Design a protein around this ligand. Structure first.
Ligand SMILES: Nc1ncnc2c1ncn2[C@@H]1O[C@H](COP(=O)(O)OP(=O)(O)O)[C@@H](O)[C@H]1O
Ligand SMILES: Nc1ncnc2c1ncn2[C@@H]1O[C@H](COP(=O)(O)OP(=O)(O)O)[C@@H](O)[C@H]1O
Ligand SMILES: [Cl-]
Ligand SMILES: [Cl-]
Ligand SMILES: [Cl-]
Ligand SMILES: [Cl-]
Ligand SMILES: [Cl-]
Ligand SMILES: [Cl-]
Ligand SMILES: [Cl-]
Ligand SMILES: [Cl-]
Ligand SMILES: [Cl-]
Ligand code: NA
Ligand code: NA
Ligand code: NA
Ligand code: NA
Ligand code: NA
Ligand code: NA
Ligand code: NA
Ligand code: NA
Ligand code: NA
Lengths: 327, 327
């Protein structure tokens, strides 16, 4: 067994539960994108650990979070690699489920660095079977994963939507603070299903596109983003944060006058996984007892640092690396 | 340790050594090929076991061959997956080498079923570091893999060419019967490098294009294949087989009159890996004491069975499938 084992007394029960995706990233660097019918060699290849779920768990785990990942992977080597990698990044793997009927989820990513273009084919694989009925059957109807001690849940939109929504609703009903980062952007049928569940979301933390999709409010800038916040409160969300890339974020705590904190000015080299860094860092800081604004200010700093180098998860900071005054 | 362990007395020593490639095939089925900058989902996914080296070993191993694979893969789970798959298909893995510095070799394959088109990006990864110098370092200058009792070596052209050529030369100097299937097709500088080594090749088994490239004879058919055999004999190759797809094969044993055997009349569904099936099966039959012609006739029948099913290694026959008198 690679996975962690729980105690019978819950001595290692997490502060933060992440219920979401784990994908291996198969990154092939190419001189040109393949034409239809073309066979080519890569110039090089990089194996990386992705999935927004894992990314967010790892962001928090790297900062020292008491975080556990709930997901589905294969019984294959990729699954075993991911389970070990999560542990090496401070993420508990006791509720990583494995199926022998599917490969671990992955992305096949082609990168032309010359052109700075990508082509990406997502293969959710095992992830497709990460259903509410399975989750229930494996967790005694969420009992095993939603202990009284649990403070935060993080979900994204990269597993079957009913798993995300049902989990959020259950967690909320037990007084867990629920965090929903609706990424990747919900499709129209997804928006419809999400909206009735927004009263069970403590913190909705979208980007500009996703805020637009949910609210109808076209978000391009601060003023419009504030408008989207109001719309999201009206849909029943308690706390709202909208990330704005290089423009930082806006937020409102429990309906207070919103605030804008602009981005840290840095040299962006690779912004892949920056949002996931922000979300995971944000929840870590809240678990350490900071309020929403204090958390988001520090999350904003961690994500800025992440965009200054390549590597996705590898670009996420550890505490010793951070400039004084972040932790 | 997933790999086999060799004995000190060498009681499990193989008849057939395959020194070549192991590639995982990561196949994403798509409704359309991605355009530059596009992120999309697959409609389904399949993980296959490929690489011409492994394919040829598994074709032999399926028939019961005492075969061993010499190759390099990662310390990654992908590498462990291949090592187990090889064992399950009757291939000894004691001289599989593993590197922590490279991923396991793979191909990233996009298939549009509707349009019957593919895009393939080959990522040799670990394979690119499977050098003569590394091989020698790990095998005490080949002594560990070229035991007295060794009857056959099979090589292809899917690892660094110096590794292939040096291995052939060494094996041949020890009285091993060396088999060289120059696939994929040699490039012009590879042809130049190969020709001086052809006297160390017991059995050169190219397809029509490869034979053309090596000899300068334009090979399209039986009569031009026969001409190519002569040119190959002139370059110092003892035994020649040229495979002709649906038209079967031609051969000459040790300068005897050339023979043509036509292809079996089957409904070709998927010919992927049929050549590898031919070559691997051929050498198994020779290890059982069939002469070249007898062995090639039976290889031709195995390869025929293989084209009647999808899935490359999945299409390679077991002994129960073969008509009377083949085994
Ligand atoms: N170019 C940048 N400079 C500084 N910070 C950035 C930059 N891009 C992203 N960030 C940080 O990452 C957060 C999320 O940005 P976003 O563009 O959504 O990331 P992603 O590339 O993962 O979508 C922002 O709120 C900000 O804190
Ligand atoms: N259409 C076919 N009909 C019968 N046998 C075939 C056919 N295609 C391939 N074969 C068998 O496979 C061998 C190699 O064929 P080839 O076309 O080189 O395979 P590949 O498709 O792997 O390139 C042939 O010598 C023959 O025995
Ligand atoms: Cl496990
Ligand atoms: Cl990584
Ligand atoms: Cl799968
Ligand atoms: Cl609010
Ligand atoms: Cl700044
Ligand atoms: Cl790191
Ligand atoms: Cl091993
Ligand atoms: Cl396979
Ligand atoms: Cl590599
Ligand atoms: Na931790
Ligand atoms: Na980065
Ligand atoms: Na066997
Ligand atoms: Na790895
Ligand atoms: Na065997
Ligand atoms: Na090794
Ligand atoms: Na022809
Ligand atoms: Na004969
Ligand atoms: Na086939």
């Amino acid at each position: 067994r690679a996975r962690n084992v729980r105690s019978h007394t819950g001595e290692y029960a997490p502060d933060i539960l992440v219920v979401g995706s784990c994908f291996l990233d198969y990154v092939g660097y190419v001189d040109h994108m393949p034409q239809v019918g073309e066979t080519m060699h890569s110039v090089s290849f990089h194996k990386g650990f992705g999935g927004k779920g894992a990314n967010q768990a790892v962001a928090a785990g790297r900062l020292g979070a008491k975080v556990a990942m709930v997901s589905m992977v294969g019984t294959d080597g990729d699954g075993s690699d991911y389970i070990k990698e999560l542990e090496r990044n401070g993420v508990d793997t006791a509720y990583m489920f494995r199926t022998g009927k599917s490969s671990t989820g992955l992305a096949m990513i082609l990168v032309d660095t010359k052109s700075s273009n990508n082509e990406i084919v997502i293969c959710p694989n095992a992830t497709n079977h990460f259903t509410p009925e399975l989750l229930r059957a494996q967790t005694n109807n969420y009992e095993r994963i939603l202990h009284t001690g649990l403070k935060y849940l993080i979900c994204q939109n990269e597993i079957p939507l009913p798993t995300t929504l049902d989990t959020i609703k259950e967690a909320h009903s037990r007084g867990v603070y629920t965090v929903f980062n609706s990424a990747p952007a919900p499709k129209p049928a997804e928006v419809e299903q999400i909206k009735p569940f927004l009263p069970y979301v403590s913190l909705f933390c979208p980007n500009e596109v996703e805020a637009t999709l949910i609210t109808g409010v076209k978000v391009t800038d601060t003023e419009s983003a504030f408008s989207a916040i109001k719309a999201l409160q009206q849909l029943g969300v308690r706390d709202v944060v909208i990330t704005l890339g290089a423009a930082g974020f806006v937020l409102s705590e429990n309906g207070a006058e919103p605030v804008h904190v602009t981005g840290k000015h840095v040299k962006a080299v690779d912004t892949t996984g920056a949002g996931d860094c922000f979300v995971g860092s944000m929840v870590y800081f809240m678990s350490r007892g900071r309020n929403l604004l204090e958390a988001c200010k520090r999350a904003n700093e961690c994500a800025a640092i992440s965009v200054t180098r390549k590597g996705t998860q590898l670009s996420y900071p550890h505490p010793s690396e951070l400039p004084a005054g972040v932790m």
